[PDB]
Scaffold this active site. Sequence first.
Site, PDB file in Angstrom:
ATOM      1  CG  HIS A  42       0.017   0.312   2.468  1.00 15.54           C
ATOM      2  ND1 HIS A  42       0.411  -0.805   3.038  1.00 15.54           N
ATOM      3  CD2 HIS A  42       0.078   1.289   3.466  1.00 15.54           C
ATOM      4  CE1 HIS A  42       0.944  -0.526   4.187  1.00 15.54           C
ATOM      5  NE2 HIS A  42       0.719   0.950   4.137  1.00 15.54           N
ATOM      6  CG  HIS A 124       7.471   4.979   0.625  1.00 14.72           C
ATOM      7  ND1 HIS A 124       7.300   6.100   1.653  1.00 14.72           N
ATOM      8  CD2 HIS A 124       7.694   3.700   1.322  1.00 14.72           C
ATOM      9  CE1 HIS A 124       7.315   5.390   2.658  1.00 14.72           C
ATOM     10  NE2 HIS A 124       7.432   4.109   2.766  1.00 14.72           N
TER      11      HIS A 124
END
Length: 175
Positions: A42, A124
């Site tokens: 995620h 990220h």
Amino acid sequence: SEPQRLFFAIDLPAEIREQIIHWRAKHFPPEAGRPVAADNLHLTLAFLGEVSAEKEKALSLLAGRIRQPGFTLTLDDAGQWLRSRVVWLGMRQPPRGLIQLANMLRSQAARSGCFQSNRPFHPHITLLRDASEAVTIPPPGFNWSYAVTEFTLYASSFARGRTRYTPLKRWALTQ
Ligand SMILES: Nc1ncnc2c1ncn2[C@@H]1O[C@H](COP(=O)(O)OP(=O)(O)OP(=O)(O)O)[C@@H](O)[C@H]1O
Ligand SMILES: [Cl-]
Ligand SMILES: [Cl-]
Ligand SMILES: [Cl-]
Ligand SMILES: [Cl-]
Ligand SMILES: [Mg+2]
């Protein structure tokens, strides 16, 4: 009732998640670090830490006030951060909408007492943890691009040596 460990995140469509894990397996031997479970991949928007039930309700209401268009993410970057020992996927030039969404949620948290790191948001997706040693990082696969339609509030829990994320609430990205 329950004091929970919370964060907001953007999720990956299943096909892209499958591509990411195939690429990761192909390019990173077990030795390189501990792979994040496919379901756990995620992109974190804001980490809230430990949140009371009352605080969670207030933050959720603020999240529900957000109005902004969806946007496209295209993962064109990969790297390693030795500082926190992770290998990650990201974007060279994240879309303005993503930065704005993150700033909004972090700002809502901060104003609600939830400490936020002064470190500039670096969106990220962590792929490997405990990657304490420098390793060769290939570019990401081709065309890892998709429309982001929602963001989600998650609770994080740990048992049996496996971390689990449980969705609590989702919000569509609307003008
Ligand atoms: N202090 C922090 N600041 C910013 N983001 C954080 C912080 N702590 C955790 N996160 C991010 O929030 C998400 C949930 O983190 P959490 O620590 O609850 O679980 P985890 O890191 O996946 O599991 P574990 O910590 O047990 O290895 C992760 O994406 C994590 O990188
Ligand atoms: Cl994991
Ligand atoms: Cl890097
Ligand atoms: Cl991370
Ligand atoms: Cl490299
Ligand atoms: Mg952690």
